């Protein structure tokens, strides 16, 4: 899920009427709920579902319903899809019937049609503080930080009932990776490896908590992955003075896998024992899964690291390290229109 699966062929679920608003109804699409024109689908119908964060280029033939939300973004004219609320009812995504896409009459349920519809991914601007000097590509020997949304995991949420999960708070900052491979120690943003300058915010955070020394102490090819947050980083939800790093993952570069949560929270223990103050994203009570997606979304709303603000949401990592997912707070998305 990195620019991929924004537009997929999916199936209408339960179609509920909107009391008082007769021209439209609410369509369940997997874990999503979506406002449609009345009678546009019956339950069981297939259509293309365009997730929130889809950027769709203007076309009043195909996308007239998006006409008066066209904008300029990367010098591209088109409509960003985002969370909205229609008459007390949450609405996320666009769900159009297959008869609208002639080119897709061969395709099958669940096909990713993003590429072939030319759909791109809207994202917030990267923070002005954090565009440093690029050294290299994000190393290909490290995975980027990424979770599938719970809304897209109905059969897997079923399958996993009874399984236990590390539950962690999702922080609104910027992805940062600090790693060792042999004689090299590097620091990465989301997409790129960075040069150490005096102005580099990520390199500064890594020096300060001594996580570089940490990796020199551990003597392993590891990537420390987490969130840089604070002042002048994405509106500073947590109301920090200055800035800081909070780990949420460690990637084993030799074995080419993440460390399970217990593997991970032990290593952090020893770092803090040897004088390496590496902070971890807030960890909550472990979860035994026996929930709907809808229930998981409800538990995502809650307090953040700063417990006086509403959090971005939660991440769930099965304790064997072989299944993880995120649930973004819909309350958060309602309050935060740049999200
Ligand atoms: Mn984020």
TrEMBL record:
GO MF terms, alphabetically ordered: ATP binding; metal ion binding
InterPro entries: RNA_ligase_dom_REL/Rnl2 (IPR021122), RNA_ligase_DRB0094 (IPR012646)
Name of a matching Pfam family: RNA_ligase
Residues the record lists as binding ATP 3: 121, 145, 147, 168-171, 190, 227, 317, 326
Binding of ATP 1, residues: 4, 121, 145, 147, 149, 168-171, 190, 227, 317, 326
Limits of the RNA ligase domain: 164-328
Keywords: ATP-binding, Metal-binding, Nucleotide-binding
Protein's UniProt name: Predicted protein
Binding site for AMP: 145, 168-171, 175, 227, 317, 326
Record-listed Mn(2+) 1 binding positions: 53
Binding site for Mn(2+) 3: 146
Organism per entry: Naegleria gruberi
Origin: domain of life: Eukaryota
Keyword ATP-binding attached: yes
Binding site for Mn(2+) 4: 172, 227
Binding site for ATP 2: 4, 121, 147, 149, 168-169, 171, 190, 317, 326
Binding residue positions for Mn(2+) 2: 123
């Amino acid at each position: 899920m990195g620019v991929r699966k924004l537009a997929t062929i999916r199936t209408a679920g339960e179609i509920t009427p909107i009391a008082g608003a007769e021209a439209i109804e609410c369509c369940h699409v997997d874990g999503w709920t979506c406002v449609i024109k009345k009678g546009e689908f019956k339950q069981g119908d297939r259509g293309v579902y365009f997730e929130i964060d889809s950027f769709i280029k203007e076309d009043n033939d195909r996308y007239p319903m998006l006409s008066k939300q066209v904008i300029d973004y990367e010098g591209q004219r088109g409509t960003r899809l985002r969370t909205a609320r229609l008459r007390g009812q949450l609405s996320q995504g666009l769900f159009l019937p297959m008869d609208r896409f002639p080119e897709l009459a061969s395709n099958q349920v669940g096909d990713d049609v993003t590429e072939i519809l030319g759909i791109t991914k809207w994202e917030p601007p990267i923070s002005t503080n954090l565009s440093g000097e690029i050294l290299g590509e994000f190393p290909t020997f490290i995975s980027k930080t990424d979770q599938e949304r719970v809304q897209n995991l109905i059969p897997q949420i079923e399958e996993n009932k009874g399984q236990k999960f590390e539950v962690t708070v999702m922080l609104d900052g910027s992805s940062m990776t600090v790693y060792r491979k042999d004689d090299h120690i590097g620091v990465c943003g989301r997409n790129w490896e960075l040069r150490e300058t005096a102005t580099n915010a990520q390199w500064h955070a890594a020096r300060r908590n001594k996580m570089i020394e940490g990796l020199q102490f551990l003597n392993r090819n590891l990537a420390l992955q987490g969130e840089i947050i604070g002042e002048s980083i994405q509106g500073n939800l947590e109301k920090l003075k200055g800035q800081d790093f909070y780990l949420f993952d460690i990637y084993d570069i030799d074995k080419a896998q993440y460390l399970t949560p217990i593997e991970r929270q032990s290593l952090v223990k020893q770092l803090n024992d040897n004088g390496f103050t590496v902070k971890h994203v807030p960890i909550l009570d472990d979860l035994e899964l026996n929930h709907t997606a809808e229930q998981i979304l409800a538990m995502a709303d809650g307090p953040s690291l700063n417990k006086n603000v509403k959090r971005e949401g939660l991440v769930f990592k099965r304790l064997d390290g072989k299944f993880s997912f995120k649930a973004i707070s819909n309350a958060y998305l309602e309050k935060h229109k740049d999200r």
